[PDB]
Amino acid sequence: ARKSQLQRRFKEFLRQYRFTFKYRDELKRHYNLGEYWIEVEMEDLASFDEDLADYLYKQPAEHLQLLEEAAKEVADEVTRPRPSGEEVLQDIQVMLKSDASPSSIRSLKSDMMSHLVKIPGIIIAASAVRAKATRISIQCRSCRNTLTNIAMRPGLEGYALPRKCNCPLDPYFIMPDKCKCVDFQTLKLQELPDAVPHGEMPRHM
């Protein structure tokens, strides 16, 4: 309920921030060129409305989804006369940027759980890019019934298939030809040599 109002506030912020419409034109250009991603500076959000900026610092998971939905709606409203064939409205990724000073990696403790953090470091390993599903469909063994458009959570979180069929127990299987996938990668970060304490081993993330 109130989350819809917050999404509307984000929509108004995106459509109204400026004496030229920075985010509006940036989103239009990115959508036209085919780059479905934007970068948002949180100082601009704080200037427009401090409430949402403060909210983003404590509960990023939900407010990020709300902001993504608002950005998608803004992009849809900006690009009304889209060319024929391109009827499908594609999702948009939102990135964050700020000028705040970073914090040392050694300061990570329990109190920083589920919060937004900024950390400097050096990369030492990068795994290959792989595919992760976002929407999946399943089919039953006996009656061949189908459940479609199951939403998957972001991050390193799995999914549990249902055990009851609305037939033997656990009859569901995943169909590979009807899924949407995105790219993901894993990296290794090491503490900066200039900040490691003397006579102590570095730490990783």
Binding site: I122, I124, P193, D194, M201, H204
Partner: protein, 221 residues
């Protein structure tokens, strides 16, 4: 707060420099020039860089060459004790801290780490080297590039990095034949090459001439 005032009052003393020179290495008898040079190296200078083209360092590297039994290692140990950031290493081998960077899984933590050499760990600090003439090719190349370019370049296991190695190097060594020969030059008496020697600002030569009074005083001490 009062420490600053005490330091300023001490600086007003007319013989502060002599006191500082005599303070270094209380347990080592003699070798006043060595202590003075070590004090000069410890205090250091000031780097300069007109624009971003001409870099001039301000570190004073020190090399000591001497006969066996002249207590060269005691000076290094004392410097390691005094210095806030000092890394001690030996060129013979089996050193606690290596002199070359490498990427490996740590035996204790069992984690994939990039361990830099002693030169990088001693950034803005002091690096002490014992048995300077026993080093291999890799250590010599690393020291040469850390003394000339003041940086270390690593290209290993898909990792390409450049790391700063701003440090002051103090090294100890022995002559080729086991005894210094005054008839020959310093370069001919050491296994090191001329470009490596040229990097050091201060070179000290220690001999073991038989002076009965000095020997008696040393034995008494």
């Amino acid at each position: 707060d009062e420490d600053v005032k005490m330091i300023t009052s001490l600086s007003k003393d007319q013989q502060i420099g002599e006191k500082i020179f005599a303070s270094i290495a209380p347990s080592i008898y003699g070798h006043e020039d060595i202590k003075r040079g070590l004090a000069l190296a410890l205090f250091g200078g000031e780097p300069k860089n007109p624009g971003g083209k001409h870099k001039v360092r301000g570190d004073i590297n020190v090399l000591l060459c001497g006969d066996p039994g002249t207590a060269k290692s005691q000076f290094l140990k004392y410097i390691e004790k005094v210095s806030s950031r000092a890394i001690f290493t030996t060129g013979q081998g089996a050193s606690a801290v290596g002199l070359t960077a490498y990427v490996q899984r740590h035996p204790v933590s069992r984690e994939w780490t990039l361990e830099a050499g002693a030169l990088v760990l001693a950034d803005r600090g002091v690096c002490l080297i014992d048995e300077f003439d026993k080093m291999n090719d890799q250590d010599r190349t690393s020291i040469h590039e850390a003394m000339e370019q003041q940086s270390i370049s690593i290209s290993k296991a898909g990792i390409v990095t450049s790391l700063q190695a701003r440090c002051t190097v103090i090294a100890a060594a022995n002559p080729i034949g086991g005894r210094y020969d005054p008839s020959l030059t310093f370069s001919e008496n050491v296994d090191l090459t001329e470009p490596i020697i040229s990097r050091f600002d201060i070179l000290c030569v220690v001999r073991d001439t038989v002076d009965p009074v000095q020997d008696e005083m040393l034995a008494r001490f």
